[PDB]
A paper describes a structure:
Highly polymorphic class I molecules encoded by the major histocompatibility complex (MHC) are crucial in the adaptive immune response to viruses and some intracellular bacteria, binding peptides inside the cell and presenting them on the cell surface to CD8 T lymphocytes. In contrast, chicken TAP genes are highly polymorphic, with each haplotype encoding a TAP molecule with a peptide-translocation specificity matching the peptide-binding specificity of the dominantly expressed class I molecule encoded by the BF2 gene, with the BF1 gene expressed poorly or not at all. In this paper, we find that two other haplotypes known to confer resistance to Marek's disease also have low cell surface expression and promiscuous peptide motifs, and examine the structural basis for promiscuous binding in three low expressing molecules. Second, we show that peptide-binding repertoire and level of cell surface expression are inversely correlated in both chickens and humans, indicating that this relationship is a fundamental property of class I molecules.
All of the other B2 peptides have generally smaller hydrophobic amino acids at P2 and somewhat larger hydrophobic amino acids at Pc. Crystal structures with two of these peptides, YPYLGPNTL and VIFPAKSL, show that Pro and Ile at peptide position P2 and Leu at Pc bind shallow hydrophobic pockets, similar to the way in which anchor residues bind pockets B and F in many mammalian class I molecules. This mode of binding is completely different from BF2*2101 that remodels the binding site, despite the fact that BF2*0201 shares Asp24 and Arg9 with BF2*2101. Structures of BF2*0201 and BF2*1401 show promiscuous binding via hydrophobic binding pockets for the anchor residues at peptide position P2 and Pc, with the class I residues at positions 24 and 9 playing supporting roles, and with residues lining the pockets explaining the relative size of anchor residues. The differences in pocket sizes are primarily due to difference in size between Val43(45) and Tyr43(45) for pocket B and between Asp113(116) and Met113(116) for pocket F, which are supported by a network of hydrogen bonds from Thr24 and Gln9 in BF2*1401 and from Asp24 and Arg9 in BF2*0201. In BF2*0201 and BF2*1401, the two Ser residues are replaced by the large residues Asn69(70) and Tyr97(99), creating a constricted groove much more like narrow grooves found in high expressing fastidious molecules such as BF2*0401. The anchor residues for HLA-A2 fit into narrow and specific-binding pockets, which allow almost only P2 Met and Leu for pocket B and Pc Val and Leu for pocket F. Although Leu and Val in particular are relatively common in proteins (so that the number of peptides bearing these amino acids should be relatively high), there is a much larger number of hydrophobic amino acids that are accommodated by the shallower pockets in both BF2*0201 and BF2*1401.
Author numbering:
A (entry chain E): 2 to 97
B (entry chain F): 1 to 9
C (entry chain D): 1 to 272
Write the structure that this text describes.
């Protein structure tokens, strides 16, 4: 099954303020998935790959998050590579 | 607290 | 009232590059508190209360089960490969067992399994028999019935599971019983002649929250798009809804947020 991905921030998108960007894919199979958060087409420094799990209907879900500071002009997005998708899909972070 | 085993399939 | 304990495993043939093949995880009241890994080979705490209020013999005894639980799943993976007559590839074994309690006493008790994203077996506690969902799981049904593991599971689900659960709730009573308030922000943008408003609750606890759009003081569940409730890194939850509307009609719409933390449901309007 194809993953349903959603990019979002932990706190309100205030420019130049500490925040945590989150990428949450869910509802996919098999569990082998490569989720990466990118800043202007470049993977974000640090990062923190959280624990994976699956729901009642045996379908997987993974959370990935990284502490950062959102600057103005810089574009943020979450790249996702899965066996079902054929070609990688990029999900864009819409601030505000 | 988890449950050990019980055995293989 | 309602407290739930759930343990979950995931044994994989092809987990990925630099990732563990086997992982065993536990959940109390829909919150991650205990974790095990194939690389680390030891159980570790995720929450503060379980880490603070637990002795070494608890972890050491639990680790011995985890190292055990890892070993059978290695054997299992190989067993299904030969039973299905498969050369290899991306296969996965899933386990899902837990117990629910209401006002002290137990209500539900389950012990299930799935192979390659499809149900394999399930322990029916009432009839005292395992069910074979797939023709390839019929041998396992005969194996697990001859050797009465069903007596062992009933002992675990009703007595063992419940006694530990009552203790876990008592440890994290404050951290499970807490309430956090959602930081809500309303925003809208022009797409292609159509205004698309969006309500976004950020950090809140517990999980179940009701967020909806109100046109002229009336709930509009048409044209509304929701992405469900999604988790955060620090043991809290997040949700998001959006509504397609006519341009100019900004003051008509209102985001109502109903949550356990809030006594009165707070309304929010778009004002820049």
């Amino acid at each position: 099954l194809t993953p349903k991905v959603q990019v979002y921030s932990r706190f309100p998108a205030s420019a130049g303020t500490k925040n945590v960007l989150n990428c949450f894919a869910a509802g996919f199979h098999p569990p082998k998935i490569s989720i990466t958060l990118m800043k202007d087409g470049v993977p974000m420094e640090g990062a923190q790959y959280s624990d994976m799990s699956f729901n009642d209907d045996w379908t997987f879900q993974r959370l990935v998050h990284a502490d950062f500071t959102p600057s103005s002009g810089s574009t943020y997005a979450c790249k996702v590579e899965h066996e079902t998708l054929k070609e990688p899909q990029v999900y864009k972070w819409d601030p505000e | 607290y988890p449950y050990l085993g019980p055995n293989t399939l | 009232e309602l407290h739930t304990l759930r343990y979950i495993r995931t044994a994989m043939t092809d987990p990925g590059p630099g990732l563990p093949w086997y992982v065993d995880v536990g959940y109390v009241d829909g919150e991650l508190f205990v974790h095990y890994n194939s690389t680390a080979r030891r159980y570790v705490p995720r929450t503060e209360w379980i880490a603070a209020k637990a002795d070494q013999q608890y972890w050491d005894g639990q680790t011995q089960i985890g190292q055990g639980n890892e070993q059978i799943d290695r054997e299992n993976l190989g067993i299904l490969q030969r039973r299905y007559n498969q050369t290899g590839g991306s296969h996965t074994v899933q386990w899902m067992y837990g117990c629910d309690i209401l006002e002290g006493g137990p209500i539900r008790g389950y012990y299930q399994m799935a192979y390659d994203g499809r149900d394999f077996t399930a322990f029916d506690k009432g009839t005292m028999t395992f069910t074979a969902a797939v023709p390839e799981a019929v041998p396992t049904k005969r194996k697990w019935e001859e050797g009465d593991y069903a007596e062992g599971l009933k002992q675990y689900l009703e007595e063992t599971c419940v006694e530990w659960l009552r203790r876990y709730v008592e440890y994290g009573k404050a951290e499970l019983g807490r309430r956090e308030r959602p930081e809500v922000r309303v925003w809208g943008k022009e797409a292609d002649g159509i205004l698309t408003l969006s309500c976004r609750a950020h950090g809140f606890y517990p999980r179940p929250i009701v967020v909806s759009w109100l046109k002229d003081g009336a709930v509009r569940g048409q044209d509304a798009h929701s992405g469900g409730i999604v988790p955060n890194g620090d043991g809290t939850y997040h949700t998001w809804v959006t509504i397609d509307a006519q341009p100019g009609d900004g003051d008509k719409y209102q985001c109502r947020v109903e949550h356990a933390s809030l006594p009165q449901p707070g309304l929010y309007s778009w004002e820049p």
